[PDB]
Amino acid sequence: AQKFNGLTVLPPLLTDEMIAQYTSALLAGTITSGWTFGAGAALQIPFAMQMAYRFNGIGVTQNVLYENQKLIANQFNSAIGKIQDSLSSTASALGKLQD
Amino acid sequence: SFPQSAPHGVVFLHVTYVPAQEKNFTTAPAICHDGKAHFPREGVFVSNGTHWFVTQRNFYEPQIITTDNTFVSGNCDVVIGIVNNTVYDPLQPELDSFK
Ligand SMILES: *[C@@H]1O[C@H](CO)[C@@H](O)[C@H](O)[C@H]1NC(C)=O
Ligand SMILES: *[C@@H]1O[C@H](CO)[C@@H](O)[C@H](O)[C@H]1NC(C)=O
Ligand SMILES: *[C@@H]1O[C@H](CO)[C@@H](O)[C@H](O)[C@H]1NC(C)=O
Secondary structure: OOOEOOEOOOOOOOOHHHHHHHHHHHHHHHHHOOOHHHOOOOOOOOHHHHHHHHHHHOOOOOHHHHOOHHHHHHHHHHHHHHHHHHHOOOOOOOHHHHO | OEEEEOOOOEEEEOOOOOOOOOOOOEEEOOEEEOOEEEEEOOOEEEEOOOOEEEEOOOOOOOOEOEHHHEEEEEEOOOOOOOEOOOOEOOHHHHHHHOO
8 A cells, every 4th residue: 555644554574585485495396206295305206207196196097198298298388378378368367366 | 183172172183104214216117028018007116226126106115027016008119218127927937837
């Protein structure tokens, strides 16, 4: 808000840089160690094997991933680009905070 | 978990499992033997430098690679990062003993 007579506004304890650092640490942990870092020490694992773990979790065998890795990677990249385009399309998705 | 009583609440005692004393090895997505790719039914293929074994995901317990704990799906010309180790089948020694 503004600054005027009668009232004042206090700054938050955590700055935006610290929140960004927290999110970056979470992203690095979740893309370099899977879900192992959420229960203890982070354990390194290649991303393809983590994806095979997740596919086995959802009920599909891992051989279909190992035989269709390039297609899945291309679909993921296209989906990320589509999310970027939709977010830049000035859609009313950020209305929850604005309200 | 075990519950406990409080004057105006409840106290929960949670017993959990935490792994420790980690060690790192070398892994491969699959094993190519006789022109066929073999995938583990459970666990992953690990190597200590000279030999390949099969262990659990959350605990280290090396096992000899066998047709019993592996399944075959297609040839080994499509999986990226496959290795060229052999597998074991006890049926051949069982047949050899029947002489
Ligand atoms: C395991 O990790 C240590 C420390 O990160 C590293 O020095 C070593 O090369 C890794 N691999 C093996 C086989 O010990
Ligand atoms: C790996 O384990 C095998 C046991 O089958 C052993 O013979 C070999 O010496 C081990 N290699 C190393 C580098 O420890
Ligand atoms: C794997 O071993 C087979 C054994 O006949 C050989 O023909 C093939 O060239 C080997 N491939 C690699 C990549 O070493």
